[PDB]
């Protein structure tokens, strides 16, 4: 099939924080990209090109460490270096909540309906019921280093977390009659696990990717614990996304090519490489229609690749 070698758009990302553990971009279901640039969050509306500076941190030294849109795309969660998880109403351009519970920066976020999960440099994960006064309703403690990858499954049955302690934990959706203990703890990656993404068409299938000392993409069945595939990507794997339309995966990388790689699933054959970034890719996010992948990189650009469409 034909995949374009050039991105559809190249957006300037001046002062993007070149910190591997942060999750600074997210594309909403309303087709709006949220981009954290140092101490500000900018919103770019894909259909119009309109840009809004949603917010700016008020204290010296403060920076944004994560952003995640709620499913409906009307609220944006913003994790900060000052251990805050802010909830912003983007229609009103106003902060609704400034939730404190963490002891260190919140570099990862993931929503499950009205529950927002947040991962911290402390290694703890907190569940926040954003609708209520005492938002902090659960603490999941399965990491000894920064939680850099955090992702609820699309069916809400599991939550995956990856850390700078080289672990992947798969958590249940509720503590039930027992406590908050992982259903699975995968120790096979020999590096930080920032890349965490669930297969959209198979409930229990998860893809994870390790850092520079690991370089592998691993596919798991979280029910059986099976490692279905382990492929060497020859670089750190910052992100992974699945195309639900093409049955493919796309991963972002660092040294030496700073490229995106498209893989055919389930064969894991290399389909294409998207080159152009001049410094390591930091994060990937997908458009709500599944056609475009935005890659944010340490070269201060956001490249938007229409790699899953011909129109």
């Amino acid at each position: 099939r034909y995949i374009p070698s050039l991105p559809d758009r190249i957006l300037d990302a001046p002062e993007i924080r070149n910190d591997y553990y942060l999750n600074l971009v997210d594309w909403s279901s309303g087709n709006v990209l949220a981009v954290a640039l140092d101490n500000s969050v900018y919103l770019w509306s894909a259909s119009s090109g309109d840009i809004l500076q949603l917010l700016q941190m008020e204290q010296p030294g403060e920076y944004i460490s994560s952003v995640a849109w709620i499913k409906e795309g009307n609220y944006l969660a913003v994790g900060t270096s000052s251990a805050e998880v802010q909830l912003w109403d983007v229609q009103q351009q106003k902060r609704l909540r400034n939730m404190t519970s963490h002891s260190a920066r919140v570099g990862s976020l993931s929503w499950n309906s009205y529950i927002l999960s947040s991962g911290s440099r402390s290694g703890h994960i907190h569940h926040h019921d954003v609708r209520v006064a005492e938002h902090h309703v659960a603490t999941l403690s399965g990491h000894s280093q920064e939680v850099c990858g955090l992702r609820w499954a699309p069916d809400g049955r599991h939550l995956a977390s990856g850390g700078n302690d080289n672990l992947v934990n798969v958590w249940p959706s509720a503590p039930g009659e027992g406590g908050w203990v992982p259903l699975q703890t995968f120790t096979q990656h020999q590096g930080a696990v920032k890349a965490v993404a669930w297969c959209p068409w198979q409930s229990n299938v998860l893809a994870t990717g390790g850092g520079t000392s690991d370089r592998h993409i691993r596919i798991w069945n979280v029910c059986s614990g099976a490692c279905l595939s382990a492929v060497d990507a020859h670089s750190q794997v910052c992100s992974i996304l699945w195309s639900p339309h093409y049955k493919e995966l796309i991963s972002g990388h660092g040294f030496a090519q700073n490229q995106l790689v498209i893989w055919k699933y389930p064969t894991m054959a290399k389909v294409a490489e998207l080159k152009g970034h001049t410094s390591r890719v930091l994060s990937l996010t997908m458009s709500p229609d599944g056609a475009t992948v935005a890659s944010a990189a340490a070269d201060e650009t956001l490249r938007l690749w229409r790699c899953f469409e011909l129109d």
Binding site: R9, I10, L11, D12, A13, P14, L33, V35, L37, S40, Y42, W44, G49, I51, Q53, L302
Partner: peptide, 6 residues
């Protein structure tokens, strides 16, 4: 340098 500009 304008943030998010083309």
């Amino acid at each position: 340098r304008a943030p998010x500009s083309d």
